[PDB]
Amino acid sequence: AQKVTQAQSSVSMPVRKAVTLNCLYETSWWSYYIFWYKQLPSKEMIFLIRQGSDEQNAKSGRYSVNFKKAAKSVALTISALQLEDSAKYFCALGELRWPDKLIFGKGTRVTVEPNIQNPDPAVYQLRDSKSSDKSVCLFTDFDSQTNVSQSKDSDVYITDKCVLDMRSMDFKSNSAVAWSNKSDFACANAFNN
Amino acid sequence: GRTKSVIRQTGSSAEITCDLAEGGYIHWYLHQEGKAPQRLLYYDSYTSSVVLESGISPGKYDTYGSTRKNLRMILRNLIENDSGVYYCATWDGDYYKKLFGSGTTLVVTEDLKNVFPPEVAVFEPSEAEISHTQKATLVCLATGFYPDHVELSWWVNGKEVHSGVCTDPQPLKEQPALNDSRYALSSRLRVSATFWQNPRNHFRCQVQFYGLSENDEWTQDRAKPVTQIVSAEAWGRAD
């Protein structure tokens, strides 16, 4: 029987650092290949690197495999992380003699976070461009170790954080957005600071 | 009308096309949320042979009946559990790795009346941010849409921008207990204070929604939620 298991569900790591994504498999095949794919939110499944069961540890650019055959362990390390490395990474097993199907794991999400060298955490209120009575709250310029608190209210929505890159200024920043359809909404107590 | 997003009601059929060229076997994989991609079947148009994986009734995925065409991927008797991302795949000629095509995202819903386009609103930057940081963050909010098949883009003076932007990685459920909940999605565009303060500069948030087609019927008191673009715009202001 063929099995592939990726026990990590999600990991976060700063830029320029490294991340190791574990993969444990079971196989009755005598010779086989392990494949790592990168799955993008656009729904693209992009081949990264292949590890042969009789080959030395595979290496390709910032991708390297630590293949421990006796342990049936095949970890992918991504070095010198970039924001564009944020994706979901899949480990797959395939047979070499008659290449047929790939047996996948469930995937491990990687979120690469910027290194905010000069944080400036602040909460701002933004008015609707057409209504002005409608508004949202913007939490911005906080460092990546900041834990954006989730909403404790049914009528209050709080997004996850994302990083934008003002590429003409060598400047990146985190932000999250909060909004509610209630006049009793304060941006101060929105993000629970 | 994008071929990567398909929305169907339970009980209908959906054809999924493969963007990879066939010479070899064409394999089809289903990837559902949080689960491992699984091969459903594979076929060879040259031999006209179809191999189904174990545990799949032969009437679920039809491949023939095409008016002089290659073997097709047509899903019959759709249920909600058919929802997911479908990939076709083929091995390279040198069998180094297996190449996947672009994924087609299929949503099967109990009633097409659950389909809604987004409302879109753009929120102008805070004067406090301008004064403190010399930057200006606009926020775009797309709300009330279903399914979650949207593409959000920012357009500045008529041109799509690719820097100073980030969009939530995942839409959130506005009513997370409904299962058929509509979605919300936010995005940020950040520019310099002086660029936002120029009244000639035009800012537009555009949300491409993939919805119903012309073959679709539907029956509900509102505009047909067809595939469409909904936008909201704001101009610069010095005050």
Numbering used by the authors:
A (entry chain D): 2 to 194
B (entry chain C): 8 to 30, 33 to 248
Relevant lines from the article:
CD1a is a monomorphic antigen-presenting molecule on dendritic cells that presents lipids to αβ T cells. Here we use CD1a tetramers to show that CD1a is a ligand for Vδ1+ γδ T cells. The crystal structures of three Vγ4Vδ1 TCR-CD1a-lipid complexes reveal that the γδ TCR binds at the extreme far side and parallel to the long axis of the β-sheet floor of CD1a’s antigen-binding cleft. Here, the γδ TCR co-recognises the CD1a heavy chain and β2 microglobulin in a manner that is distinct from all other previously observed γδ TCR docking modalities.
To understand the molecular basis underpinning γδ TCR recognition of CD1a, we determined the crystal structure of the CO3 γδ TCR alone at 2.0 Å and in complex with CD1a-endo, CD1a-sulfatide and CD1a-DDM to a resolution of 3.2 Å, 2.7 Å and 3.0 Å, respectively. Here, to crystallise these ternary structures, we engineered a hybrid TCR fusing the variable CO3γ domain to the constant TCR β domain and the variable CO3δ domain to the constant TCR α domain, as done previously. The comparison between CD1a-bound and CO3 γδ TCR binary structures indicated minor conformational changes within the Vγ4 domain of the CO3 γδ TCR. The most notable conformational change corresponded to the hypervariable 4 (HV4) region, which is thought to bind butyrophilin-like 3 protein and remained solvent exposed in the CD1a-CO3 γδ TCR complex. Transient transfection of the CO3 (Vγ4 Vδ1) and CO22 (Vγ2 Vδ1) γδ TCRs into HEK293T cells demonstrated that both γδ TCRs bound to CD1a-endo tetramer, but not to CD1b-endo, CD1c-endo, or CD1d-endo tetramers. Of note, the BC14.1 Vγ chain, which did not support CD1a-endo staining, differs only in 3 amino acids from the CO3 Vγ chain, while the DP10.7 Vγ chain differs by only 2 amino acids, suggesting that tyrosine at position 104 (Tyr104) within the CDR3γ loop is essential for CD1a-endo recognition. Accordingly, both γ and δ CO3 TCR chains are required for CD1a-endo binding and Tyr104 is apparently essential.
